[PDB]
Design a protein around this nucleic acid. Sequence first.
RNA 1: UCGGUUUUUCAACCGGAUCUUUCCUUCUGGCUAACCUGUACUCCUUGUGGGUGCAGGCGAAC
Lengths: 184, 129, 155, 150, 81, 87
Amino acid sequence: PQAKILSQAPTELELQVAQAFIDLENNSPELKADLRALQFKSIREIEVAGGKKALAVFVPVPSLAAYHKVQIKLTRELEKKFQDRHVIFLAERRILPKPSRKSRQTQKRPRSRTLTAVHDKILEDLVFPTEIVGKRVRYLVGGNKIQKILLNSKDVQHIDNKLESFQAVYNKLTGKQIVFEIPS
Amino acid sequence: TRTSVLADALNAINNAEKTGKRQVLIRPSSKVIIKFLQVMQKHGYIGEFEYIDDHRSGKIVVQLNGRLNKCGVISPRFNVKIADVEKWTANLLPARQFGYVILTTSAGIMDHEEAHRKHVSGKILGFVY
Amino acid sequence: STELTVQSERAFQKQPHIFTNPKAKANRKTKRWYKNVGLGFKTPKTAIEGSYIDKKCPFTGLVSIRGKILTGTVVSTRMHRTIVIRRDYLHYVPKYNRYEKRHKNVPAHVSPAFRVQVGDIVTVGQCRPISKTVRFNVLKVASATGKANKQFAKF
Amino acid sequence: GRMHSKGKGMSSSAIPYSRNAPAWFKGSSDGVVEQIIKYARKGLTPSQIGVLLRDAHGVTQAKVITGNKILRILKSNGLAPEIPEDLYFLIKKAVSVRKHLERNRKDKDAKFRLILIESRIHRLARYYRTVSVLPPNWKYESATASALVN
Amino acid sequence: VLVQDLLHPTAASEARKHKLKTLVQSPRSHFLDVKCPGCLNITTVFSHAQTAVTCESCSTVLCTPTGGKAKLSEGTSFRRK
Amino acid sequence: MENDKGQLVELYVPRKCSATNRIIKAKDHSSVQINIAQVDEEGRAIPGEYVTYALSGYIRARGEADDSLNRLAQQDGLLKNVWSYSR
RNA sequence: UCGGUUUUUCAACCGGAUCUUUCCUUCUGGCUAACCUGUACUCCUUGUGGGUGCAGGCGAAC
Ligand SMILES: [Zn+2]
């Protein structure tokens, strides 16, 4: 169960995560068999400005619903075992390039592998079972695109201690600056 | 039919500037409109502006500086041939000097000066003087 | 296009200066002469596997493609072994700085190396004057099906 | 601004900002699918099915809940009608109008309305031909239209 | 007029303005979670109807469709969402 | 503006309105200079030193001018609460 | 320096090469040019100052 639940398994961090998962399995009726049908493509470590660190756990995609079914509890448990650091369950998506006027036909691209769509999906996922209200995008006089993301006025506190971390993760992923917001 | 969208965007903006609104709401709002606005910004005609990601088509809120005078989009997108550019600028802009003709090219939606420097031109969209 | 029959005229027709020796043993019997037209075109197998003669074909005849190579939609198939391509283009009036959707019909002889249906785009080539109006040979009916195997909506 | 009158209405169904499922509203996807298929079997036409789902059951829009559309789902299960729903309805309306006209010889307004209906049908027919849902060179009008209806 | 910091207005203005003409459009129609005097079960029923709406299996009829918001059948308790 | 090697030309450098940035014209027989006094504790209204605005004729003519002035005040800290961002 | 001259201090400006979750139509062989190279190690300022050199292998230099 160590070098098995990892799709392709090289790194020590991955092994540690697997071990943690195994340890978690001690709960039994709700946090086993449901957790057995879950794999990590890989993990990416994102360093957040403020002492704390963030961990992006990549998931192959058809698994996402299952992960969501668990998630919150699982995340909490992971936080408990891997202290200080926050964990984001993320879905790895392919992002097929744009066809060029010259470049030979890639039997059409679906609007799923487009960059924008992928980024939107990441935003949906990276942010909790919180569900995004609206987006604004600011463009500032200098020339700095700043995504501004609106969050549900209910639940909330599941996100407060992570917002900066989330932002950092997003920046590392894409390059765009996210600001998170909640209305009154 | 809202046939052309850039046109619509500019018209409302123009109206706002004429009244002395500090802000406009643009209804449909494209890639093209955004690019145009960016171009305007780069030479400081428009302030901040915020594209609402409507889970639909779009919406742009603009901040006006009062530095706008008229922003026009020309009706068909006339394909324009590097020398034609000069003619257009003579016609469309208040001086041999300042303001910009905003022509779309293969290298992107630039103003006219930039296009000349880059040595590439294409179809015209708007202008800003 | 031709469509069946093979050897149905008042005369009886064969490829000229190309001859099948009755003396030699061959299961293939008839020797077909073909021509690789060139210009990056793949010469359709439905000539080499084919049985027709047809003097105005670019592959199995003395007609040879030089000069212009154009494209365009097929309007009309209504006459035998030839086609009417409609090469539609935009011509410019400077006085207004604007354009015309202009017509013009190219009649092109079609080798029966092709199955050409109304609406299909055709890479056609210029050649030796076939007849009266026809000065082009159909070279590539590039639209192979255009939803023909998958027309039905039900799963 | 309305295809046939001088009227310029903006009564319309709106849509919610979330493409995601509305959280608390339970059930599943499979159940929803089953319901849809049952409704299809019963002879209801897409819009009707959707309506049924929305009000009695825990449905907002099938796209939100299942992933795929209603029509798409129908196509997948092979239960969708041969002439598209809207078009079919239009045809029915036309038939009705024709019937009325048959009875009432002098009813100019009705005739005029029938003309408009026919025009609408033609437009729809054309677009179906273009997207290939009605097999090409099929025209829908007066004599055969009635036969088509049922 | 002149300046109206657009994107965030008051909830009252939003409530007043036509629910299509707002910023981010959201329906101002609810899901009545309705209880009947018969069985102890709740049904998720849209605030508008277009259908005479019976229960999960029972022929109770929850709501009669008027032009807009559904007028509920005499004495039936209902939650929200 | 400037004649090549420095040397400023173009005299009468237009007042711009503080509300609209629209140029206050030469015969703006409609526009105004608003002067508001910088103020201090017990009596004290500090003569000589004002926070000043110009309002162009056009806005005033339109009618919406008071609100603009309020806005200007709230920015330069001559008021608090009076005029809000959202209406 | 006997009105012109080029680098550093400096920018804007166009261009190219790139990795980023991102490929430029693809390989049969020519040709590999140089090192991803090391086979002996040293003429030599106490040494990554400097490469004549042949067996695994970068293709874009066409
Ligand atoms: Zn009930």
